[PDB]
Amino acid sequence: NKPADDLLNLEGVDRDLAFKLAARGVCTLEDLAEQGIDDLADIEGLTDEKAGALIMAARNICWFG
Amino acid sequence: MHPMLNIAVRAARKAGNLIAKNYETPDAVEASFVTNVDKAAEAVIIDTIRKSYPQHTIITEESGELEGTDQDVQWVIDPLDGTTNFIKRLPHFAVSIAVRIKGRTEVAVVYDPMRNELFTATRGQGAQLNGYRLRGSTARDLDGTILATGFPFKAKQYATTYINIVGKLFNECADFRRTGSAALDLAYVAAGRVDGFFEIGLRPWDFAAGELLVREAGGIVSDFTGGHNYMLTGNIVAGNPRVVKAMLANMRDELSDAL
Amino acid sequence: GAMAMHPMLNIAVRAARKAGNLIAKNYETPDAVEASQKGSNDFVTNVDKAAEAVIIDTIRKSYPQHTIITEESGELEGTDQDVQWVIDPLDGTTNFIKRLPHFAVSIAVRIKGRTEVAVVYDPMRNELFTATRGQGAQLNGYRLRGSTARDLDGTILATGFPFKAKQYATTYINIVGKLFNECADFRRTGSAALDLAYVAAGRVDGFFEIGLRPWDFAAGELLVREAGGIVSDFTGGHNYMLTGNIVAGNPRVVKAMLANMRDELSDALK
Ligand SMILES: [Mg+2]
Ligand SMILES: [Mg+2]
């Protein structure tokens, strides 16, 4: 369970976090846009404030071009 | 089985009983009034909560923030969602109760006392209607969809923006529903009775319970820009991820002109 | 008080309650519901057809001589041409398919083209709306008296979107926005027969919709009229009988709606 390049290349995602997301089935940038903050809870090192900023950035790229 | 859920249900059903008894009394047209039904329902709910959890904070529209010594737990209450419907004896209205712990919503109840429909959810455990598990709408885009909504009657400086948003969505969706209860609109998104919901300028007690029903039935909830600031702005979009994405994309150009 | 019942109203209520039972049983166990698409966003089920058969069977056991008119069967002509039963077996089929529990059975009886008795029945709430010409309208036996609004300020207007005739979309949206300058809010429920019953009961203050079919409003029109209201087309005339462009409410609400709408009307709506 590996991440895609559009997720690995998103600012603020380190390689560790990328692989932690892919472990939960969040493997691409478009998958990250579809999450709620609650879906990312209890990720070592990931605050709720950063979870929200990452999901917003994924939507800006994938949904709003 | 969550104990707090048990108490939230108990309070909602006691308030609903009282509302339904006042629904049977003569309305303003027939009479051609001293009992605030919202306030009497509010009192029943606060009494039921405090008899089990006297330390907790309670927040409602009629009373504002009643601070408790345990500020880590808040009950967020609409004692009667759908006041105009009740006044005209249109029998679509609800009691809404949400419990938030350390800033996260953990328990939700929306209770329709005229149909005896109890919508419940707890965080990480799913959502139910009268015991049956809810899974939301299967729509993959807006083709053929029914969107619930409300008009900005409390904020008419936004009337033109809102009418423009409705008109553009209507070229993609099939129809709309305007019921008069945001709490039940969100419950109906969770049940798949409508395919999504949007409204401007709601207050936290309007949607605090309904938004957890949606998310526990597979949906997402966002603000009108796609962010997570809806608890602060009260501009709500809700539905499954494909429906929400399509709604936000459709609306975006009009929002830019407004700002 | 002493209760009574007109004989044709008795049979209309019997037919609507039997069809309504069948509809509600299929709602609770929809494993056998089969939907089919008529036209644009317009559906018909096997439940619709079974309810229609129940209504026709009930009418014909007591009045085999009378004509019956429905959408799916057309005009079933009878030997007594003075009387016509005008039926909608299930109004609100999109709500029914989605399990949104707001739908109804509508039955009107006309003598020489004039409505004499009417029934609109909600089988999920068990709400029976009835009317007899010259004798008033009722909900579950209680007499209806409409809304007391004197103009559009503070009013709640029921409406339907032109989801089956979207060539009217731009004009309809303009009419809604202009009405919103004066009224308070709208309701969009998905049953036109129940929207007209709610005007009669004062649960909303008025109603407007483009292009309804005759069985959509035949019964609801008599409910509105027997509770003190009027029905007109979008210019205040009588052509709604031919176009289905309907405005309904008490006389002062309808006058105010028509004055607001006048300058937004397209040629097709004139
Ligand atoms: Mg309220
Ligand atoms: Mg029908």
Domain ranges of chain C: 1-144, 145-270
Would you say B83 is a known binding-site residue?
A: yes
User: By the 8 A CB rule, do C106 and C120 touch?
Assistant: yes
For the domain made up of C1-144, the CATH class stated in words is: alpha beta
* Experiment used for this model: X-ray
Q: Which residue has the tokens 């087309």?
A: C233
Helix (H, G, I), strand (E, B) or coil at B62: coil
- Tell me the pairing of strands C114-122 and C104-111: antiparallel
User: By the 8 A CB rule, do C131 and C223 touch?
Assistant: yes
- Burial of B116 (C-beta count, 10 Å sphere; 0-12/13-18/19+): exposed
SS3 content of chain B, % helix, strand, coil (to 5): 40, 25, 35
Q: What is the CATH number of domain B135-259?
A: 3.40.190.80
Residue B42 CA: distances (Å) to CA of B51, B59, B76: 14, 11, 11
CA–CA separation, B100 and B73 (whole Å):
6
Locate B152 and state its tokens.
């900005």
- Burial of B226 (C-beta count, 10 Å sphere; 0-12/13-18/19+): buried
CA–CA separation, B228 and A51 (whole Å):
10
Query: What element of type H or E holds C198?
Result: helix C192-201
CA–CA separation, B174 and C40 (whole Å):
9
Query: What element of type H or E holds B221?
Result: strand B220-222
CATH number at residue A34: 1.10.150.20
Single-letter amino acid, residue C54: V
Q: What is the CATH number of domain C145-270?
A: 3.40.190.80
CA–CA separation, B220 and B242 (whole Å):
10
Do at least 3 CB pairs under 8 Å connect A with C? no
As for how many domains chain A has, the answer is 1
Q: How far is the CA of B211 from the centre of ligand 1 (A)?
A: 16
CA–CA separation, C249 and C265 (whole Å):
19
- Tell me the pairing of strands B196-199 and C230-232: unpaired
Question: For residue C87, which ligand has an atom nearest its CA?
Answer: 2
Q: Please enumerate residues of A whose Cβ is less than 8 A from a Cβ of B.
A: 33-34, 36-38, 52, 55-56, 59-60, 63-64
What is the C-alpha radius of gyration for chain B, rounded to an integer number of angstroms? 18
User: By the 8 A CB rule, do B205 and B96 touch?
Assistant: yes
User: By the 8 A CB rule, do C124 and B116 touch?
Assistant: no
DSSP string, C18-37: HHHHHHHHHHH-GGG--EEE
Closest residue in B to A65 (Cα–Cα): B249
B239: nearest Cα among B184, B198, B178, B182: B198
Residue B95 CA: distances (Å) to CA of A65, B11, B75, B98, C198: 40, 9, 13, 10, 23
Which strands form B146-149's sheet, in the order they lie side by side? Answer: B175-177, B146-149, B196-199, B236-239, B220-222
CA–CA separation, B163 and C247 (whole Å):
21
In the CATH scheme, what architecture does the domain B1-134 have? 2-Layer Sandwich (3.30)
Q: How far is the CA of B85 from the centre of ligand 1 (A)?
A: 11
User: By the 8 A CB rule, do B56 and B70 touch?
Assistant: yes
CA–CA separation, A63 and B247 (whole Å):
11
Would you say C88 is a known binding-site residue?
A: yes
Domain that holds residue A40: 4-63
Please enumerate in sequence order all residues whose Cβ is within 8 A of that of B10, keeping only pairs 6 or more positions apart, or say none.
Answer: B48
CA–CA separation, B213 and C163 (whole Å):
29
Helix (H, G, I), strand (E, B) or coil at C132: strand
The interaxial angle of helices B159-170 and B241-258, nearest 10 deg, is 140
Q: Which residue has the tokens 């400086």?
A: B157
* Residues in C touching B159 (Cβ below 8 Å): 177, 180-181
- Taking the Cβ of residue C124 and every Cβ of chain B, the question of whether any pair is shorter than 8 Å is answered with yes
Would you say B25 is a known binding-site residue?
A: no
